[PDB]
Design a protein around this nucleic acid. Structure first.
Lengths: 120, 121, 209, 56, 114
RNA sequence: CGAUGUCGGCUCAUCACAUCCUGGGGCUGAAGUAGGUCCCAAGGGUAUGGCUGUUCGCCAUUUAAAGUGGUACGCGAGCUGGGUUUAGAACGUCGUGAGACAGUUCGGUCCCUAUCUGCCGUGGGCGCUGGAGAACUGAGGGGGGCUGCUCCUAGUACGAGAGGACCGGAGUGGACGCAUCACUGGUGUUCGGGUUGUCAUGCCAAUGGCACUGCCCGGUAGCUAAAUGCGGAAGAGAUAAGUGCUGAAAGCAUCUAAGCACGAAACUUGCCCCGAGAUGAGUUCUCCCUGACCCUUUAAGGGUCCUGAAGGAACGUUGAAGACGACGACGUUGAUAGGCCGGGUGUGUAAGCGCAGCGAUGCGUUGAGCUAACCGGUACUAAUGAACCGUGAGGCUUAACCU
RNA sequence: AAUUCCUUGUCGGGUAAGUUCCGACCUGCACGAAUGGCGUAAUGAUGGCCAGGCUGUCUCCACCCGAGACUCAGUGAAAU
RNA sequence: ACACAGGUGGUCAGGUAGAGAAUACCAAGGCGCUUGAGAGAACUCGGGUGAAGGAACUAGGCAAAAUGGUGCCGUAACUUC
RNA sequence: AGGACCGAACCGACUAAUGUUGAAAAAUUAGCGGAUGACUUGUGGCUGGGGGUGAAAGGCCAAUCAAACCGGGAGAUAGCU
C-alpha cells in the first residue's frame, strides 16, 4: 500500500507529471476557474498554493523563479500584482475547492475549483 | 565473505588470488569471512617461494570485506580481502611478516600467535 | 501478573556507557485505572479490565458511558483482559503504571505488526524463486506445483502462498527493561516491538523468553 | 477448462444475489434554497449555504 | 516530537568541533584493554554526512598500508572521546562517497565560505 | 487407442518407517577410547561443487547427519526441452537397391482467458424470538520444536601410560524461523546538485525542452536485507524400550498373576495464533424503548392513526488501514486532511549586483540559495442540509420466590 | 575418429574435484586412398574446449519507473 | 476477412550538429493513432538501479552487461607472402 | 583492382523475448548477415500435373504439393466404425 508518502504516479508518465500544470495553472491566470477531475483538483491543490506564496514579491529572483515554474512572460506580468498579495489576508487556503457531480461522457468526477479571491 | 572470491595474501608465503573452496563449521552460509577458518586453494603464488599453485591450505581472513562491527555506530570495514595461511595439520601462522591491519576476531584471542606478527589497528 | 497498556512511537538508539546503537521504543503509559475486577463468583474469571488514556468524550455511545456510571471515568481507549491470580488489585481507580514493576525482563508485548496489505508468493513461507531466462521462461514468482495426481486426489488444506499478513495479534516475549519511570512513565526496552508506530500495546509479564 | 455441465439459474441468480446499485439514504435538502441534491455535491448552480456561487 | 528533542540532547555531544568534510583529522577514541583505557589514533579523512537529530557519520579512510580501513563515528557514543579538526578544507561537492577513490595524487582540499 | 504427453532437471513438496543425526535402553570378545551388535524411538533436522543429459554413479571438500521407500518410477491445464522417436544431414555397418540400424554424430515450433470439485485469503446474507453497544469463557483447530563447538566440572573418573569421560553447569556459533527500520547499508525516474549535443524564451544574461530516466553524481521519507533485536525453553502429567519393589499360584524362585515405583527429542500439557455459525449460536458487562385504535379464525395475527429510542446506516475530511469489501480517527464540541508558518532534514557557497581578470574564470556580497515523504504549532480551505434506517418493556410450559 | 562394440579403454596434461576437453598409446567389434586418403593459410549468424573481460545467470534477493491485472462508467466475445 | 500493430513500386531530400539517406535536436508541413476515468494488491509483461561476491548458475554465460570514436604509438603464432 | 571490408537505403532471414481464443491463417520487438555483386528491384512475356520448375529440401507451382485445381466417371468401393 501507500503509507506516509505523498509521491504520486498519476495516470501520467513521469515527465508528463511535471509538465501538465503549465496547462492547468496556465488556466488559473486566465479566468481563475477550472473544471477538471476532482481528486486531480486535490493534486492541483498543492501546486497552486505554493505558487501564490512565491508570488508574494516580484524581486528579480522570484520573477526568475517564475521562469522555473511556467515561463509565459505574459502571465508572470499578471503575477505579483493581486496574485500573491491579495491572498496575504489569510494563511493558506488561497483556493476553495468545492465538490460536484459527474461528467456527461462515461464517469469521472466533476470539480468547480477556483481561486478564493477575485471578487468573492 | 562468500565462498569462491579471490583473496589476497596478507602474509609473505604466497601472492595474489587464493580461492575459498569451503565455508567450514556448516553449510548454507552466505558468510565466509572474519577470523573463521576456511579451507583454501592456492592457485596463485609467488614463484620464488617454496610452494606454487593448485595447493590447498586453510586461512583466517585478517582484513575482511564487510569487516567487523560492534554496535555503537562503529563499524570497522577493511577494503582488503587479505588472509593468512595456515597448516592443515596444526594451523599456526605460516607467515613471519604480515602486512596491513588485523581483525578484532583474532584480537579476541582465538589465535594468540597472529596478532604478534602483524602490525596495525 | 497484570500488564500495562503502553503505546509505540518509533525506534531510536538506547545508549549505555559504551553508547550502543540498539533499538527501543519510548512507551507512554497514561494511567491504567481499574474499571472492574472479574471474579470467581461472576463465572470462573479472575481478571481485571481497565482503562488507559483519554478519548474525545463527545464521540462515545451511551452504553459505553454507562459502565462509567458504575465506574470512574478517564475516557479509556479500550477494555482489556488482564489475568491475575488472587487479589492484590482492586476495583478503585488505581491509575497504576510502569513504576510498579521494575524487575521485569520478560514481558509479552502484543502489537499487531506492520500492516502492508496481504502479500503473495515468496512472502508467505518465503519460497525460493524459479529461474529467470537461463533455464525457465514465464515463472519467477509464479508458484510451481500444488500436488501429485489421483493420490491424494486433491490439494490439501496445508500450504498457503497468499494468505493475509499482519493486522492481527502477535506476541514477542523476553525484553529486558533499563528504565522504569514515573516522570512521563517511560519504559526503555530491548527493542524491535511490532507495530506501525503509535500502536497501543500491552506490556505484561511472561514465563518464557 | 470449460463447462462440462451447463449451469442452472440456481448458479446464475446466486452470484447475483449480491448484485447491488445505489442507495440514497434520502436525497439531501438545502437549508438555504430547499434544493434537493445529495450533500457535498452541486445542487445545479453551486447553491450551498446562503449562496449561489458560480451561479448556473 | 514530544517524547524526544527534550530527552535526546542527553546523549548528544554537541560540544564537538564542526567542519565541512575533507580534513586532516586525528580522532582519539577510547580503546579498552579490559584493565585500563587509552586513546588510539585514527589519522584519516572525513567524508561526513550531516546530523539527523541524533545520528551522524564521520567515516574516515585511514589509508593504513596504502589501502584504507574505514571507521564511521557519530559523536554521541560516550566512548568516542575527542576529535580534532586540525587542517580543514573541502571538495566543491559536499558529499564524498566516490571522491575518495579518486586518488593517484589526490588530496587537494580547500576553503571558501561564500 | 472417439488421444491417460516419455525420462531427467526445475519448482513445490507431502506421506510411510524397514531411523542417517539428535533422544532412551540391552548384550558385548564395552577399561576409557572410539566402537561392534540388538531393542525402543517419526519431535525436529538431514551438504555444496567437478565430470556426466544420466536420475543413478564416481570423485572432491564439507557436515551433527548428508537416511530409505511411497505419492500416475509424486509434480509439463506450474516452468524447461537437456536426454528422448518427426521430416534435414553425415559417419560406421547391413542391403542388389530403395532404404534400414532398441549403433553413432550435428541442426531441428511445449497450446488452452478455468464452468465444476478441491485449496489460500477476505467479505456479504440470515439467525441465536424486544432492540442495541461492548468484554471474554474455551468447545475445538492450527502454528512452534534443530544442532555442533568452546569453556567449566575435569585433564577429574577411568587408564601403568598414551589417551581420556559420566552426570550436571555456563558460554559462543552454524543452519532455520519471528519481529524491526533505531543503527549499517541498498534503492529512492515526487528531491538537491553537476553536465555534453541541440532546439527554444525576440536577443545579452539568466532560464526551459528533447536527446534510454538525455547522461552522471549525491540523497530524505517509505520500503527493504547484506542491517538490527528476538525465538525455538524451563517445568508438570501419563508413558515406551527398559529398570523396579512387594509376591503367591509352583513351601523355593519368580517386576506380575493381586497390589504398589520409576523411566525417552515419542505422548498429554506448558508456549504462540484463530476461536460461540461451539445452530452445543454459551457467559459476563452496559445501554435504550414501558401510546392509542379498529378487524379478527386469535399465546397466531391483520389492518389504521400517533410515534420511533439507544444505536445504526449513509454523507464528508481522511488514516502508519486497505485489491474490493473490511477496520481506524475526526467533521466547527474541530487538528481529520490539505494548505500556512516555524524547525528539522538533504543537498552545498544562488540569482542579481560589485571587484579583479583580455578571457576562461576567480573572489566578495553569501558556507548562499533551494528543499519530500519528516517534526512542532496554526482552522486559512475542505470537513454544508439535520435527511434515512432502527421502534414502542419481552410467546408459551413448568418450577422457585413475592403476594 | 561425427567410425571403437568391450569402454568413464590405458597413460600424460589441465581441474582440488576434468564420465567432457587436449596430447600420446593402439585393445582398428565394424578407417583407408576421386560413392578419394592425409595435410592446409584464410574463412564460418558452424561443432567441441578454455582463458581474460563483464556482469542479478547464480549466491540471495531488494528498491524504483511504465503497460495490465484490480475499482467505476460506456460498449461487449469465445471455445465448451 | 476489419477504419486490421502487416504488404506496396516511382519522384522530391530544408536548418543545426554530424563522414552521411547514420543519428540527435529542429523546420515547412502533417499528425496525438474511435472506449474513457480511478484505485495504484498479488502476479505478469515492458523498462531502470542495485551492498558484497563474480558463472558458484545451467545440459549451455540463454540473456543482459560491458566493448565502441578520431589521430597517433604499437602488434605474436602462423602464411597461399 | 577486388564473387574486398565497415555500414545506411535496400535486400535477406541466424538468436532471443513477447505473442501463441494473436494486431498477425508465421507477425511484432530487441539483436544478426549481405550491401558492385554467383547482387537486387519494376514492368511485361514465356514453361502445366505421372507434368513443369528446382545451386536438391521430394522443395515450389493461389495459406496446400510423394505427381495442383474444376467438372464428369460417381451414389467409386467400404468382409469396416
Amino acid at each position: 500500500m501507500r503509507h506516509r508518502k505523498s509521491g504520486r504516479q498519476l495516470n501520467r508518465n513521469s515527465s508528463h507529471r511535471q509538465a501538465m500544470f503549465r496547462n492547468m495553472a496556465g488556466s488559473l491566470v486566465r479566468h481563475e476557474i477550472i473544471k477538471t477531475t476532482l481528486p486531480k483538483a486535490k493534486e492541483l491543490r498543492r501546486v497552486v498554493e505554493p505558487l501564490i506564496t512565491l508570488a508574494k514579491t516580484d524581486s528579480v529572483a522570484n520573477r526568475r523563479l517564475a521562469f522555473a515554474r511556467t515561463r509565459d512572460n505574459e502571465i508572470v506580468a499578471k503575477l505579483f500584482n493581486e496574485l500573491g498579495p491579495r491572498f496575504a489576508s489569510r494563511a493558506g487556503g488561497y483556493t476553495r475547492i468545492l465538490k460536484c457531480g459527474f461528467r456527461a461522457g462515461d464517469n469521472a468526477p466533476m470539480a468547480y475549483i477556483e481561486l478564493v479571491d477575485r471578487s468573492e | 565473505i562468500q565462498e569462491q572470491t579471490m583473496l589476497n595474501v596478507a602474509d609473505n608465503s604466497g601472492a595474489r588470488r587464493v580461492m575459498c573452496i569451503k565455508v567450514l563449521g556448516g553449510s548454507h552460509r552466505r558468510y565466509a569471512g572474519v577470523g573463521d577458518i576456511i579451507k583454501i586453494t592456492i592457485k596463485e603464488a609467488i614463484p620464488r617461494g617454496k610452494v606454487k599453485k593448485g595447493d590447498v591450505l586453510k586461512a583466517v581472513v585478517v582484513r575482511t570485506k564487510k569487516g567487523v562491527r560492534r554496535p555503537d555506530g562503529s563499524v570497522i570495514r577493511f577494503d582488503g580481502n587479505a588472509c593468512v595461511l595456515l597448516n592443515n595439520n596444526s594451523e599456526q601462522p605460516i607467515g613471519t611478516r604480515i602486512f596491513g591491519p588485523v581483525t578484532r576476531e583474532l584480537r579476541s584471542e582465538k589465535f594468540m600467535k597472529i596478532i604478534s606478527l602483524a602490525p596495525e589497528v | 501478573m497484570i500488564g500495562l497498556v503502553g503505546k509505540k512511537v518509533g525506534m531510536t538508539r538506547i545508549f549505555t556507557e559504551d553508547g550502543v546503537s540498539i533499538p527501543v521504543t519510548v512507551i507512554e503509559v497514561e494511567a491504567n485505572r481499574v474499571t472492574q475486577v472479574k471474579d470467581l463468583a461472576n463465572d470462573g474469571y479472575r481478571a481485571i479490565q481497565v482503562t488507559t488514556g483519554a478519548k474525545k468524550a463527545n464521540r462515545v455511545t451511551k452504553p459505553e458511558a454507562g459502565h462509567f456510571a458504575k465506574a470512574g471515568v478517564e475516557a479509556g481507549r479500550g477494555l482489556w483482559e488482564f489475568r491475575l491470580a488472587e487479589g492484590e488489585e482492586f476495583t478503585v481507580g488505581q491509575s497504576i503504571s510502569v513504576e510498579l514493576f521494575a524487575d521485569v525482563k520478560k514481558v509479552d508485548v502484543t502489537g499487531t505488526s506492520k500492516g502492508k496489505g496481504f502479500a503473495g508468493t515468496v512472502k508467505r513461507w518465503n519460497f525460493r524463486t524459479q529461474d529467470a531466462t537461463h533455464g525457465n521462461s514465464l515463472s519467477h514468482r509464479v508458484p510451481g506445483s500444488i500436488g501429485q495426481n489421483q493420490t491424494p486426489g486433491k490439494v490439501f488444506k496445508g500450504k498457503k502462498m497468499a494468505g493475509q499478513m499482519g493486522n492481527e495479534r502477535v506476541t514477542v516475549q523476553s525484553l529486558d527493561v533499563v528504565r522504569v519511570d514515573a516522570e512521563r512513565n517511560l519504559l526503555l526496552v530491548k527493542g524491535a516491538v511490532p507495530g506501525a508506530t503509535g500502536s497501543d500495546l500491552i506490556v505484561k509479564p511472561a514465563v518464557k523468553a | 477448462a470449460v463447462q462440462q455441465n451447463k449451469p442452472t439459474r440456481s448458479k446464475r441468480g446466486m452470484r447475483r444475489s449480491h448484485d447491488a446499485l445505489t442507495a440514497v439514504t434520502s436525497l439531501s435538502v438545502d437549508k438555504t434554497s430547499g434544493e434537493k441534491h445529495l450533500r457535498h455535491h452541486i445542487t445545479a448552480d453551486g447553491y450551498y449555504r446562503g449562496r449561489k456561487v458560480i451561479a448556473k | 516530537s514530544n517524547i524526544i528533542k527534550q530527552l535526546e540532547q542527553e546523549q548528544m555531544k554537541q560540544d564537538v568541533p564542526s567542519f565541512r568534510p575533507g580534513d586532516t583529522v586525528e580522532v582519539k577514541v577510547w580503546v579498552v584493554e579490559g584493565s585500563k583505557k587509552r586513546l588510539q589514533a585514527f589519522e584519516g579523512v572525513v567524508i561526513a554526512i550531516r546530523n539527523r537529530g541524533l545520528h551522524s557519520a564521520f567515516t574516515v579512510r585511514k589509508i593504513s598500508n596504502g589501502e584504507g580501513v574505514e571507521r564511521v563515528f557519530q559523536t554521541h557514543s560516550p566512548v568516542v572521546d575527542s576529535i580534532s579538526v586540525k587542517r580543514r578544507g573541502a571538495v566543491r561537492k559536499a558529499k564524498l562517497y566516490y571522491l575518495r577513490e579518486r586518488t593517484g595524487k589526490a588530496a587537494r582540499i580547500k576553503e571558501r565560505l561564500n
